[PDB]
Design an enzyme around this catalytic site. Structure first.
Site, PDB file in Angstrom:
ATOM      1  N   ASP A  29       0.779  -1.249   0.000  1.00 59.20           N
ATOM      2  CA  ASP A  29       0.000   0.000   0.000  1.00 59.20           C
ATOM      3  C   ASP A  29       0.812   1.302   0.000  1.00 59.20           C
ATOM      4  O   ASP A  29       0.230   2.386   0.123  1.00 59.20           O
ATOM      5  CB  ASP A  29      -1.020   0.009   1.148  1.00 59.20           C
ATOM      6  CG  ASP A  29      -0.363  -0.013   2.533  1.00 59.20           C
ATOM      7  OD1 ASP A  29       0.866   0.045   2.594  1.00 59.20           O
ATOM      8  OD2 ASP A  29      -1.059  -0.084   3.568  1.00 59.20           O
ATOM      9  N   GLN A  89       2.621   2.536   2.180  1.00 58.88           N
ATOM     10  CA  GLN A  89       2.777   3.089   3.524  1.00 58.88           C
ATOM     11  C   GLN A  89       3.743   2.202   4.323  1.00 58.88           C
ATOM     12  O   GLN A  89       3.556   0.989   4.390  1.00 58.88           O
ATOM     13  CB  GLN A  89       1.428   3.164   4.233  1.00 58.88           C
ATOM     14  CG  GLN A  89       0.406   4.069   3.574  1.00 58.88           C
ATOM     15  CD  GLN A  89      -0.854   4.169   4.401  1.00 58.88           C
ATOM     16  OE1 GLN A  89      -1.957   3.934   3.898  1.00 58.88           O
ATOM     17  NE2 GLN A  89      -0.697   4.478   5.698  1.00 58.88           N
ATOM     18  N   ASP A 143      24.773   9.423   9.470  1.00 56.31           N
ATOM     19  CA  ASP A 143      26.222   9.353   9.319  1.00 56.31           C
ATOM     20  C   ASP A 143      26.700   7.942   9.007  1.00 56.31           C
ATOM     21  O   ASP A 143      27.699   7.765   8.302  1.00 56.31           O
ATOM     22  CB  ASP A 143      26.963   9.958  10.532  1.00 56.31           C
ATOM     23  CG  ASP A 143      26.498   9.386  11.889  1.00 56.31           C
ATOM     24  OD1 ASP A 143      25.658   8.460  11.968  1.00 56.31           O
ATOM     25  OD2 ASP A 143      26.975   9.882  12.928  1.00 56.31           O
ATOM     26  N   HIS A 151      28.613   7.081   5.738  1.00 56.58           N
ATOM     27  CA  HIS A 151      29.916   6.462   5.955  1.00 56.58           C
ATOM     28  C   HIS A 151      30.062   5.261   5.017  1.00 56.58           C
ATOM     29  O   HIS A 151      31.083   5.110   4.328  1.00 56.58           O
ATOM     30  CB  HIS A 151      30.036   6.039   7.434  1.00 56.58           C
ATOM     31  CG  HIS A 151      31.232   5.186   7.761  1.00 56.58           C
ATOM     32  ND1 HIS A 151      32.260   5.628   8.569  1.00 56.58           N
ATOM     33  CD2 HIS A 151      31.542   3.907   7.428  1.00 56.58           C
ATOM     34  CE1 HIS A 151      33.159   4.663   8.702  1.00 56.58           C
ATOM     35  NE2 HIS A 151      32.752   3.611   8.009  1.00 56.58           N
ATOM     36  N   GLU A 152      29.041   4.414   4.979  1.00 56.00           N
ATOM     37  CA  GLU A 152      29.138   3.196   4.183  1.00 56.00           C
ATOM     38  C   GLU A 152      29.140   3.516   2.679  1.00 56.00           C
ATOM     39  O   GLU A 152      29.959   2.969   1.935  1.00 56.00           O
ATOM     40  CB  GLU A 152      28.037   2.190   4.543  1.00 56.00           C
ATOM     41  CG  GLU A 152      27.902   1.838   6.039  1.00 56.00           C
ATOM     42  CD  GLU A 152      29.139   1.190   6.651  1.00 56.00           C
ATOM     43  OE1 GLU A 152      30.142   0.960   5.950  1.00 56.00           O
ATOM     44  OE2 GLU A 152      29.086   0.896   7.858  1.00 56.00           O
ATOM     45  N   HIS A 167      32.479   4.588   1.398  1.00 52.10           N
ATOM     46  CA  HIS A 167      33.441   3.526   1.050  1.00 52.10           C
ATOM     47  C   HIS A 167      33.361   3.206  -0.435  1.00 52.10           C
ATOM     48  O   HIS A 167      34.368   2.917  -1.059  1.00 52.10           O
ATOM     49  CB  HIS A 167      33.216   2.244   1.862  1.00 52.10           C
ATOM     50  CG  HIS A 167      33.760   2.307   3.261  1.00 52.10           C
ATOM     51  ND1 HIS A 167      35.050   2.709   3.534  1.00 52.10           N
ATOM     52  CD2 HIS A 167      33.199   1.996   4.456  1.00 52.10           C
ATOM     53  CE1 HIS A 167      35.255   2.657   4.841  1.00 52.10           C
ATOM     54  NE2 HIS A 167      34.156   2.212   5.418  1.00 52.10           N
ATOM     55  N   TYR A 187      42.463  -1.573   2.606  1.00 51.42           N
ATOM     56  CA  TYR A 187      41.848  -1.579   3.920  1.00 51.42           C
ATOM     57  C   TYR A 187      42.746  -2.208   4.978  1.00 51.42           C
ATOM     58  O   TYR A 187      42.398  -3.220   5.596  1.00 51.42           O
ATOM     59  CB  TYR A 187      40.498  -2.283   3.852  1.00 51.42           C
ATOM     60  CG  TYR A 187      39.538  -1.837   4.914  1.00 51.42           C
ATOM     61  CD1 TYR A 187      38.974  -0.567   4.874  1.00 51.42           C
ATOM     62  CD2 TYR A 187      39.193  -2.681   5.964  1.00 51.42           C
ATOM     63  CE1 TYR A 187      38.080  -0.151   5.840  1.00 51.42           C
ATOM     64  CE2 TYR A 187      38.298  -2.274   6.945  1.00 51.42           C
ATOM     65  CZ  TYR A 187      37.749  -1.005   6.873  1.00 51.42           C
ATOM     66  OH  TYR A 187      36.863  -0.587   7.835  1.00 51.42           O
ATOM     67  N   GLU A 216      38.895   4.738   6.393  1.00 58.08           N
ATOM     68  CA  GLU A 216      37.891   4.871   7.445  1.00 58.08           C
ATOM     69  C   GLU A 216      37.597   6.330   7.795  1.00 58.08           C
ATOM     70  O   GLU A 216      36.437   6.715   7.991  1.00 58.08           O
ATOM     71  CB  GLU A 216      38.384   4.145   8.706  1.00 58.08           C
ATOM     72  CG  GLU A 216      37.961   2.723   8.736  1.00 58.08           C
ATOM     73  CD  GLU A 216      36.457   2.600   8.641  1.00 58.08           C
ATOM     74  OE1 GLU A 216      35.732   3.284   9.410  1.00 58.08           O
ATOM     75  OE2 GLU A 216      36.002   1.833   7.800  1.00 58.08           O
ATOM     76  N   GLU A 245      25.651  14.409   7.360  1.00 54.10           N
ATOM     77  CA  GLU A 245      24.789  14.685   8.514  1.00 54.10           C
ATOM     78  C   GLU A 245      24.549  16.184   8.670  1.00 54.10           C
ATOM     79  O   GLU A 245      23.427  16.612   8.958  1.00 54.10           O
ATOM     80  CB  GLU A 245      25.377  14.085   9.805  1.00 54.10           C
ATOM     81  CG  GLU A 245      24.453  14.185  11.017  1.00 54.10           C
ATOM     82  CD  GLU A 245      25.033  13.457  12.219  1.00 54.10           C
ATOM     83  OE1 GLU A 245      25.388  12.262  12.070  1.00 54.10           O
ATOM     84  OE2 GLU A 245      25.178  14.080  13.297  1.00 54.10           O
ATOM     85  N   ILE A 300      22.013   4.182  26.776  1.00 56.42           N
ATOM     86  CA  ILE A 300      22.957   5.206  27.241  1.00 56.42           C
ATOM     87  C   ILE A 300      22.838   6.518  26.438  1.00 56.42           C
ATOM     88  O   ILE A 300      23.082   6.536  25.227  1.00 56.42           O
ATOM     89  CB  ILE A 300      24.425   4.705  27.143  1.00 56.42           C
ATOM     90  CG1 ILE A 300      24.614   3.360  27.873  1.00 56.42           C
ATOM     91  CG2 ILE A 300      25.410   5.788  27.626  1.00 56.42           C
ATOM     92  CD1 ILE A 300      25.958   2.710  27.633  1.00 56.42           C
ATOM     93  N   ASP A 315      41.997  -5.356  14.088  1.00 49.43           N
ATOM     94  CA  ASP A 315      41.212  -4.370  13.338  1.00 49.43           C
ATOM     95  C   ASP A 315      41.946  -3.944  12.052  1.00 49.43           C
ATOM     96  O   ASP A 315      41.988  -2.756  11.701  1.00 49.43           O
ATOM     97  CB  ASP A 315      40.889  -3.176  14.251  1.00 49.43           C
ATOM     98  CG  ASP A 315      40.023  -2.135  13.581  1.00 49.43           C
ATOM     99  OD1 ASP A 315      39.125  -2.528  12.807  1.00 49.43           O
ATOM    100  OD2 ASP A 315      40.240  -0.935  13.844  1.00 49.43           O
ATOM    101  N   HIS A 371      39.955   1.425  12.344  1.00 54.89           N
ATOM    102  CA  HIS A 371      38.917   2.198  13.052  1.00 54.89           C
ATOM    103  C   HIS A 371      39.445   2.879  14.305  1.00 54.89           C
ATOM    104  O   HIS A 371      38.680   3.530  15.024  1.00 54.89           O
ATOM    105  CB  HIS A 371      37.744   1.311  13.471  1.00 54.89           C
ATOM    106  CG  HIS A 371      37.051   0.653  12.327  1.00 54.89           C
ATOM    107  ND1 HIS A 371      37.357  -0.628  11.913  1.00 54.89           N
ATOM    108  CD2 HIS A 371      36.055   1.087  11.519  1.00 54.89           C
ATOM    109  CE1 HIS A 371      36.591  -0.944  10.879  1.00 54.89           C
ATOM    110  NE2 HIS A 371      35.787   0.073  10.628  1.00 54.89           N
TER     111      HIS A 371
HETATM  112 CA   LIG Z   1      23.629   5.695  23.125  1.00 53.04          CA
HETATM  113 CA   LIG Z   2      26.921  12.048  13.938  1.00 58.73          CA
HETATM  114 CA   LIG Z   3      23.722  13.722  15.129  1.00 58.29          CA
HETATM  115 CA   LIG Z   4       2.581  -1.078   3.929  1.00 60.85          CA
HETATM  116 ZN   LIG Z   5      33.921   2.046   7.450  1.00 62.07          ZN
END
Ligand SMILES: [Ca+2]
Ligand SMILES: [Ca+2]
Ligand SMILES: [Ca+2]
Ligand SMILES: [Ca+2]
Ligand SMILES: [Zn+2]
Length: 316
Positions: A59, A61, A138, A142-143, A146, A157, A166, A177, A197, A226, A231
């Protein structure tokens, strides 16, 4: 699919209402034909098979909780496309309006998102560490960034080149953003990280050390975790970018800020004109100095500020 362009309405991960470009042919699909060769959003259905199915809705929505990660992956891909086109004159990630594909509901309780060389992929989070990750503008930008890097600098990488890769994604994720002008900041992932948090984020560009990341070359991570700290050591470059834009003092070195728009111009030119797959931090500095020189002149404030920012983070 072949159909007609339509406009639906839905709610994103944070409960905000927005219109989305869709395509009608029996069902309403998350397919936006208004941008380049299209933006396509898929349902991975809690599996790890990709892309999954093109998102179909009866629909037009999109207010179900199951719909929210798709709404935002789709909408924020659009905003990111608009940023690159309007701000940098770049048409999609390949500069030739390549179709943009995203999959949501990837796996079960998956606390991450990524660009896989072909498309963006978003977990739903486990509801403790993360809520669905496409809820972060963001994060999406960010993605998708890349992808831009893959087609331009091609930064490997790993180690320093990977940390630049990164940082480039955090830089443009943040600039997007700001472009959308929805609660913008210099933190990464704050809208989807730790719903229990308040006030935290995954990374900080203004103070990388807030979340354990180095803000000076002397504190760089030298181990193998990493991918050699891609990162982690990104905080050194994130800090330099933050300083170039915002100015400030850092380890007793003063930087005159030149603002976001110029930061974006300098780093976009560096990424697309000077960086290579194996560029290190030192080479990034040089790329950014050269970019600022092209745009504003060798004697400019902009060039001087780039130098002071890299000085501040101990990168010569
Ligand atoms: Ca949080
Ligand atoms: Ca941000
Ligand atoms: Ca923000
Ligand atoms: Ca729907
Ligand atoms: Zn990344």
């Amino acid at each position: 699919i072949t159909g007609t362009s339509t406009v639906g309405v839905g709610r994103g991960v944070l409960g905000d209402q927005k219109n989305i470009n869709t395509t009608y042919s029996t069902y309403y699909y998350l397919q936006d034909n208004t941008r380049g060769n299209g933006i396509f959003t898929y349902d991975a259905k809690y599996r790890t098979t990709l892309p999954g199915s093109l998102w179909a809705d009866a629909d037009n929505q999109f207010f179900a909780s199951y719909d929210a990660p798709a709404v935002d992956a789709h909408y924020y891909a659009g905003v990111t496309y608009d940023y690159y086109k309007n701000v940098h004159n770049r048409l999609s990630y390949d500069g030739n309006n390549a179709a943009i594909r995203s999959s949501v509901h990837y796996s079960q309780g998956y606390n991450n998102a990524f660009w896989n060389g072909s498309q963006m992929v978003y977990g739903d989070g486990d509801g403790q560490t993360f809520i669905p990750l496409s809820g972060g503008i963001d994060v999406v930008a960010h993605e998708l960034t890349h992808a831009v890097t893959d087609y331009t600098a091609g930064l490997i990488y790993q180690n320093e080149s990977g940390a630049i890769n990164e940082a480039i994604s955090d830089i443009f994720g943040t600039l997007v953003e700001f472009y959308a002008n929805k609660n913008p900041d210099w933190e990464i992932g704050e809208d989807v990280y730790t719903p229990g948090i308040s006030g935290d984020s995954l990374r900080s560009m203004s103070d990388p050390a807030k979340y354990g990341d180095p803000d000076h070359y002397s504190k760089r991570y030298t181990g193998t975790q990493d991918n050699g700290g891609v990162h982690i050591n990104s905080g050194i470059i994130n800090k330099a970018a933050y300083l170039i834009s915002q100015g400030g003092t850092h380890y007793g070195v003063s930087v005159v800020g030149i603002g976001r728009d110029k930061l974006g111009k300098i780093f976009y030119r560096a990424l697309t004109q000077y960086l290579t797959p194996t560029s290190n931090f030192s080479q990034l500095r040089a790329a950014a100095v050269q970019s600022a020189t092209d745009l504003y002149g060798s004697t400019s404030q902009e060039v001087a500020s780039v130098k002071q920012a890299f000085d501040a983070v101990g990168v010569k």
